[PDB]
DNA sequence: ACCTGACTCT
DNA sequence: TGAGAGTCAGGT
């Protein structure tokens, strides 16, 4: 039972210039959430503070906001955002153990102090799930149990900083932490806190129209089935399709009949019900997920959504986005794309500005593989899919048909995401054998890419991991598996992670560079969102001309590759219009 | 409360 | 026959 002072006032010895700090927010969504307790561990001791005391104390608040008073934390964004909602600035966080653990091995799934500490044989700290419980039973425990937990977390941070930093340095990842992921965390905190304004009235009227179209289609489906059933139950729908209407079973799921859209598209010729089911699902997804789902997470006092970017989750160095996920808002189909008309600037006379990299992943591949053909294509700023078609099919540009371009694009999608010949076969509705032929023809036209793929798979086997341009790492222990599919996937990930992960590295560095430039230029523009290869901002209408020049340049110059980077941009009165 | 299947994005 | 994030409805 670890020693500490349960303090009832802040003292000067709590305000040392180096500390482990815990500012505990237990709610999963930390926006405008309570802080339940505070712990400080430093050279003078271990301290627990009640937040109503600490956060009302001017000296404690000044210390929190003093850049020269250095703090080590776990998940500093969570604390920084919760403090922002209370009007308190957190500065001086020089070490974030969450981000340190994530960089060392994203596959460990570190999401609490205990999990990080276990990586270095430190077990004098309980998992948060053990203290707070889970789901319905989740609760803040009584003060003695809470205070000991927060102090043990602070103690672990204090003890673990040096070994984590030492391993990062050995991995050549120390700058990645201190110069890239930590500064980014502050930028993400500001994006999240600013939020995105939503035109809820427009969403509600869309919901009304959708509801009417769903009722029409649903009724059509029942008259075509000759009975009512739950269309959203793949079990009940499978009985109607495959038993009652006797449609061919072209594919199964672990549990029953497949009703995936690609299966359904093949069955459309047999019965009118099928097109109606596909339309019902399209409309229902928009209704349940992007109208109703979105409305439920808009804050009613300000009509904004405040996402949380998980910076320490994905295996490739991408962010993820939650509550709402603003990285999967519809765009491909025009009916869904209209959802974007609901995402508006937060101030009158402001506009939405969106800038995206053109083919960043294939450009990164050109650079890392040093493929002469691919590097020449991007040096000419060619349409990469048309050029890929010319090469794999050996035809001139004016002989490339739409279908040839489509198939070439699919081969390029495959390379960008590292999918298998089976995956490409499925995407193109062709045999595995034919997909393998496509892939072989690609390697004849891009032999540098082939050499890269061979060379990286050997490197992953030898080292045990692969790396990205800015030294992000992904371990691939399955590369030696005696199971063909398992090993093949690891080999694809060896090839793919440096492409996907380097693209994540670049856009992160661009975000950092852009925030610095916006401040230097005294612009009011602010970053709202990142969507993997694109950045969305809002700014006064009077700043658009400057941003047209500034934002693409900053993004294009974030790194210097053997090929140029190219950024496209658009702006308008809503996110829909920034196209 | 977790799992499955379907669907959205890059 | 693994790209992998998040969300939803249904269903054990
Ligand atoms: O605060 C985000 C940060 O916390 C973790 C747990 O360490 O994720 C928690 O919070 C997220 C934000 O709501 C949730 O999506 C997630 O389910 C929850 O565990 C980290 O994974 C994340 O980086
Ligand atoms: Mg793009």
- Separation CA A137–CA A54 (nearest Å): 28
**Which residue in the block uniquely carries the two structure tokens 């699902």?**
A281
C-alpha angle A292-A346-A299 in degrees, rounded to nearest 5: 40
Question: Do A169 and A65 contact (CB within 8 A), yes or no?
Answer: no
Tokens of A457: 């798979």
Looking at the structure, do residues A322 and A216 belong to the same domain, yes or no? no
Locate A579 and state its tokens: 């196209």
Q: The domain spanning residue A152 has which CATH number? A: 3.30.420.10
φ, ψ for residue A140, nearest 5 deg: -75, 130
Closest Cα to residue A65, out of A114, A21, A33?
A21
Coil/strand/helix, residue A291: helix
How far apart (Å, rounded) are the C-alpha atoms in residues A301 and A85?
A: 14
* CATH number for the domain harbouring residue A535: 3.30.70.370
- The distance of Cα A386 from the centroid of its chain, to the nearest Å, equals 30
Do both A372 and A457 map to the same domain? yes
Same domain, A496 and A560: no
How far lies A244's CA from each of A10, A109, A238, A254, in Å? 73, 46, 9, 21
Coil vs helix vs strand at A45: strand
Q: Which residues are placed with Cβ below 5 angstroms of ligand 2, an ion? A: A 356
Ligand 1 atom showing the smallest separation from residue A74 Cα: 7
Tokens linked to A57: 């104390």
Residues A209 and A255 in one domain: yes
**Rounded Cα gap, residues A342 and A574, in angstroms:** 7
Select from A474, A503, A532 the last residue of a domain.
A503
Structure tokens at A549: 């020049």
Strands in A212-305 per DSSP E: 304-305
By the 8 A CB rule, do A81 and A189 touch?
A: yes
Which domain CATH number covers A462?
1.10.150.20
Joined together, the tokens standing for residue A306 give: 């405040």
Domain count, chain A: 4
Q: Strand C-proximal residues, CB under 7 Å?
A: A 230, 232-233, 235-236, 288-289, 292-293, 296, 310, 313-316, 318, 320-325, 328, 417-420, 422-423, 432, 485, 489, 492-493, 496
Q: Are A484 and A401 in the same domain? A: yes
What DSSP state is assigned to residue A66?
Answer: -
Quick check: helix, strand or coil at residue A2? coil
Q: Please report how many Cα atoms fall inside a 13 Å half-sphere around the Cα of residue A90, on the Cβ side.
A: 27
Residue A256 per-residue DSSP state? S
Q: What gap in Å lies between CA A399 and CA A403, rounded to an integer?
A: 11
Q: How far apart are CA A516 and CA A180, in angstroms?
A: 13
Residue with the smallest CA separation from ligand 1 atom 16 is A28
Cα A47 to Cα A40: distance, rounded to the nearest angstrom: 5
Which tokens is A148 given? Answer: 């000991």
Please tell me whether residues A37 and A177 are part of one structural domain: yes
Query: Scanning the structure block, which residue is given the tokens 């899919």?
Result: A385
Quickly give A314 CA vs C5 C1' distance in Å: 8
- Tokens coding A168: 């990062």
Count the neighbouring beta carbons within 10 Å of the beta carbon of residue A465: 18
Beta strands in A477-576 (DSSP E): 526-530, 534-540, 567-572
Q: Helix, strand, or coil here: A257?
A: strand
- The owner of tokens 């050549």 is A172
How many CB atoms neighbour CB A503 within 10 A?
25
Of how many residues is chain A composed?
Answer: 579
- SS3 call for A473: strand
Where among A193, A221, A254 does a domain terminate?
Answer: A193
By the 8 A CB rule, do A92 and A66 touch?
Answer: yes
In sequence order, what E strands does A235-371 have?
304-305, 308-310, 320-322, 343-344, 350-357
Nearest alpha carbon to residue A41 among A91, A88, A68, A7:
A7
Residue that is written with structure tokens 């001086």 in the block: A92
User: For chain A, what is the radius of gyration of the CA atoms?
Assistant: 27
Q: Nearest CA to A77 among A394, A311, A246? A: A311
Is A310 close to ligand 1, i.e. is its CB under 6 Å away? yes
- Residue A13 is labelled as binding a ligand: no
Q: Give the pair of three-digit tokens for residue A58.
A: 């001017």
Best CA proximity match to A544, nearest among A511, A518, A516, A572: A572
Q: Quote helix, strand, coil % in chain A, to nearest 5.
A: 55, 15, 30
Shortest CA to C1' contact from A488: nucleotide = C2
Residue with tokens 């999990």: A115
Contacts of residue A170, defined as CB under 8 A and 6 or more positions apart, other chains included, come to none
SS3 A245: coil
User: By residue range, what is the domain housing residue A322?
Assistant: 309-359+504-578
Cβ(A90)–Cβ(A79) under 8 Å?
Answer: yes
Rounded to whole angstroms, the Cα distance separating A392 from A53 reads 69
Q: Do both A495 and A511 map to the same domain?
A: no
- My answer on whether A439 and A517 are in the same domain is no
Method: X-ray
- Determine the Cα–Cα distance for residues A144 and A163; give it in Å rounded to an integer: 30
Q: Tokens 């700290």 sit at which residue?
A: A125
Among A373, A300, A381, residue whose Cα is nearest residue A564: A381
Q: Convert A348-408 into a string of H (helix), E (strand) and C (coil).
A: CCEEEEEEEECCHHHHHHHHHHCCHHHHHHHHCCCCHHHHHHHHHHCCCHHHCCHHHHHHH
Cα torsion for A118, A122, A124, A125, to the nearest 10°?
Answer: -40
Q: Are residues A374 and A241 in the same domain?
A: no
Q: Are A331 and A286 in contact (CB under 8 A)?
A: no
Total Cβ atoms within 10 A of residue A356? 19
Quickly give A240 CA vs C11 C1' distance in Å: 18
Among A193, A222, A238, the domain-final residue is A193
E-strand ranges in A170-243 read 196-198
A95 and A12 in a common domain: yes
CA closest to C1' of B5 belongs to A234
Question: Distance from first CA to last CA of chain A, Å, rounded?
Answer: 59
CATH code at position A243: 1.20.1060.10
Give the torsion sign (CA, A307, A312, A315, A318). Answer: positive
For the CA of A312, the nearest atom of ligand 1: 23
Q: A222 and A148 in one domain?
A: no
Which ranges constitute the DSSP H helices of A66-142? 76-84, 97-104, 113-118, 128-132
Check if the beta carbon of residue A355 is closer than 8 Å to that of residue A567. yes
Distance, CA of A403 to CA of A546 (rounded, Å)? 40
CA A111 to CA A99: how far, in whole Å? 10
Measure the CA–CA gap between A534 and A355, rounded to whole angstroms. 6
A396/A408 Cα distance (integer angstroms): 14
The answer on A465 and A372 residing in a single domain is yes
Classified as helix, coil or strand, A486 is: helix
Contacts of A439 (CB under 8 A, 6+ apart): A411, A414, A421, A424
CA nearest to A273, candidates A317, A239, A313: A239
Query: In a 3-state reduction of DSSP, which class is residue A4?
Result: coil
Q: Which nucleotides of B are covered by protein (CB under 7 A)?
A: 1-2, 4-10
Cα A524 to Cα A211: distance, rounded to the nearest angstrom: 40
Distance from residue A323's CA to nucleotide B2's C1', rounded to whole Å? 20
């Amino acid at each position: 039972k670890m020693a500490f002072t349960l303090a009832d006032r802040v003292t000067e010895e709590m305000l040392a210039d180096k500390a482990a700090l815990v500012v505990e927010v237990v709610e999963e969504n930390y926006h405008d959430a309570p802080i339940v307790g505070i712990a400080v561990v430093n050279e003078h001791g271990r301290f627990f503070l009640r937040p109503e005391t600490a956060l009302a104390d001017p000296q404690f608040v000044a210390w929190l906001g003093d850049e020269t008073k250095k703090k080590s934390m776990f998940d500093s964004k969570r604390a920084a955002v919760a403090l922002k909602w209370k009007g308190i600035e957190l500065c001086g966080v020089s070490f974030d153990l969450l981000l340190a653990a994530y960089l060392l091995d994203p596959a460990q799934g570190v999401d609490d102090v205990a999990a990080a500490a276990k990586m270095k044989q430190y077990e004098a700290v309980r998992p948060d799930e053990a203290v707070y419980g889970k789901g319905a039973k989740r609760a803040v425990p009584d003060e003695p149990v809470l205070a000991e937990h927060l102090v043990r977390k602070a103690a672990a941070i204090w003890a673990l900083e040096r070994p984590f930093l030492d391993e990062l340095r050995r991995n050549e990842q120390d700058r990645l932490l201190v110069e890239l992921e930590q500064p980014l965390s502050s930028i993400l905190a500001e994006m999240e806190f600013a939020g995105v304004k939503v035109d809820t009235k427009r969403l509600e009227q869309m919901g009304e129209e959708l509801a009417e179209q769903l009722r029409t289609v649903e009724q059509r489906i029942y008259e075509l089935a000759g009975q009512e059933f739950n269309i959203n139950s793949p079990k009940q729908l499978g009985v109607i399709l495959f038993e009652k209407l006797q449609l061919p079973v072209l594919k199964k799921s672990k549990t029953g009949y497949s009703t995936s859209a690609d299966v359904l598209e093949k069955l459309a010729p047999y019965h009118e019900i099928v097109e109606n089911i596909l339309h019902y699902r399209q409309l229902g997804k928009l209704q349940s997920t992007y109208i109703e789902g979105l409305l439920k997470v808009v804050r009613p006092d300000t009509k904004k959504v405040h996402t949380i970017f998980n910076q320490a989750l994905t295996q490739t160095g991408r962010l993820s986005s939650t509550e709402p996920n603003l990285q999967n808002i519809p765009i491909r189909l025009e009916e869904g794309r209209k959802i974007r008309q609901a995402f508006v600037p937060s101030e009158s006379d402001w506009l939405i500005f969106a800038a995206d990299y053109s083919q960043i992943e294939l450009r990164v591949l050109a650079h890392i593989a040093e493929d002469d053909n691919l590097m020449e294509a991007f040096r000419r700023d060619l349409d990469i899919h048309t050029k890929t078609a010319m090469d794999i099919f050996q035809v001139s540009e004016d002989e490339v048909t739409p279908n040839m371009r489509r198939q070439a694009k699919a081969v390029n999608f495959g390379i960008v995401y590292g999918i298998s010949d089976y995956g490409l076969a499925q995407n193109l509705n062709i045999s595995r054998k034919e997909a393998a032929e496509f892939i072989e023809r690609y390697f004849e036209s891009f032999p540098g890419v082939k050499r890269y793929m061979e060379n990286i798979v050997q490197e992953a086997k030898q080292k045990g991991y692969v790396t990205t341009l800015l030294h992000r790492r992904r371990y691939l222990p399955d590369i030696t598996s005696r199971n063909f599919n398992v090993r093949s996937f690891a080999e694809r990930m060896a090839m793919n992670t440096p492409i996907q992960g380097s693209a994540a590295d670049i856009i992160k560095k661009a975000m950092i560079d852009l925030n610095a430039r916006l401040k230097e230029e005294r612009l009011q523009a602010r970053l709202l969102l990142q969507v993997h290869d694109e950045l969305i901002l809002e700014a006064p209408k009077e700043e658009m001309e400057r941003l047209c020049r500034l934002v693409p340049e900053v993004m294009e110059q974030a790194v210097t590759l053997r090929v140029p980077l190219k950024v496209d941009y658009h702006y308008g009165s809503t996110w829909y219009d920034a196209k």
